[PDB]
Amino acid sequence: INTVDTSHEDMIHDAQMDYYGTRLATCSSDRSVKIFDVRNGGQILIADLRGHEGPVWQVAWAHPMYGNILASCSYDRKVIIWREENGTWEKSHEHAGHDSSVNSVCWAPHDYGLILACGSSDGAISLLTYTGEGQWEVKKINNAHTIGCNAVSWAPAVVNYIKRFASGGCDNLIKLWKEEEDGQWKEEQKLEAHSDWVRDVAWAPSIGLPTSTIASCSQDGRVFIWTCDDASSNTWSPKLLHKFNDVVWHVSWSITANILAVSGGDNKVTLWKESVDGQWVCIS
Template sequence: MTTAEPSNPVPVDATPGPIYIDTQHEDMVHDAQMDYYGSKLATCSSDRTIKIYNVSENAYELSATIQGGHEGPVWQVSWAHPKFGVLLASCSFDGSVLLHQEVRPREWTVIHAARHLHESSVNGVAFAPHEHGLLVAAASSDGRVSVLQHEAANNTWGVHYLTDCPLGVNAVSWAPWGAFYQADQVEAPRLVTAGCDNQIRFWIYQEGQWTTDSSIVLDVTEVAHKDWVRDVAWAPVLLPNHNMVASCSEDGSVIVWTQVPPANVDGDENTQESFSQWKPTLLHKFDAPVWRVSWSVTGHFLAVSAGDSDVTLWKAGLDGAWSQVSTVDAQSTSQGQ
């Protein structure tokens, strides 16, 4: 059920800096995501609701409250590309993934309810790049990742399952379109997942099935997570075969994995190795668990949300070393409210 909210824009301080929004959730907020245009904000909470806000540089307003769909805490939300309409996916402790669409301004409806999609909590959800079609991946504590695919011909949804980590999967992220390039080949969808076995895993869709991407080799000899990997995020790509993935862990570590471009074989520029190595760089070791990592649109900045109530912003220098450039801490948050 959707509750349309009255239009009462709340002005915000015009001074440059963070904008604080009173979400009006009745319990802990677990995720907040901006849409493609940066004009809508979706939040989800342990109160089992999703709230949609219209936002601008100098005001925000609560547009709708989506409630009654999930039977447990809602962990994460994800916006689809606008070519598919105003579409939002949500995942919950109840093992389900729901797809919500704004059919009219301020009016939302569930267009697909994948209930009991998993046998345990669904911890992460993400839409694929629109070039692959309408696909949404979900990571679950039952150790599997599901990929929902919309069949436009008959308006139905199919599902593929990946058996990932037996201990559970906390997050999933898609490779951006253009992340990998091979002449005369259509780019295959790829995923990276965050597991409760302290590892990240890469997956590729080939010949009608999802398999482990054996072309990616991770160098874990010096830097690795020592506890659950809580989140993983594939950076936007500016050049093919120049990829970065950020992961964060319960142990407080944030690692940036950087692809080493495939080397030429025997000096032949048209022949490359069939695999690529990924080198890890420890961005920082926090004193508290790190829950979320998120890239800027260009992939130049990385936001990190940790258990110390701080959100920090990081940027890599020309030498490859990461440095903190900004922070939003609990003290400033309380002052802003």
């Protein structure tokens, strides 16, 4: 247990961490980012990136399959990619199309390629599948929601391929999106059980077992698990969790889909795990 020096003048929003565990990441309301040295437990700043014109939310990293890449998304509508070049951190390439404030950003499995995904309040699903020679082949899917998308999550690589991802917006609804053989990201299913504004969606990493799991947290209390045990049936059978006193916005999985930790409006983190009888049990 070691506490990193914040050194910021704004409230943080998310703190992702690189693949090997070396460097921490940061967000704030001053439109600034900072990557530190978690190695050996001694917090050393390696950059203070003067970023966009507004606060940022998510900084999810990428696989070293393609190298040292960073992602960022801000209230000032802009998508920015950073790469640590020659001992320094500097701008690499950007996406421009953003009618409204962007809500989320996540990367793709390191077998589909080097694909980004983002969602803005404009309700347009704009994948940012990075092409060759530094350009990004920005595909788009407009009017993905009545109000706007909030968060997206990708699906583990299972046997080209059959790519997938899941998303949900402020319409109190959750969507899923597959691709045709030509490359049309039209629709696969529309799962709806919550009435509050769903915020975050995640996929449990696939060990090899033929059972998926989508833990999603809505605005009020909906923390329903979205298990899809049958591959052909494509039927999702809820198994609702406890009801949080305040709003829950974040969800995160362990590396073997054993432990689920959720973040809520009570400024507290509770760690959960499914019991023998199939019920989810909280922990210390």
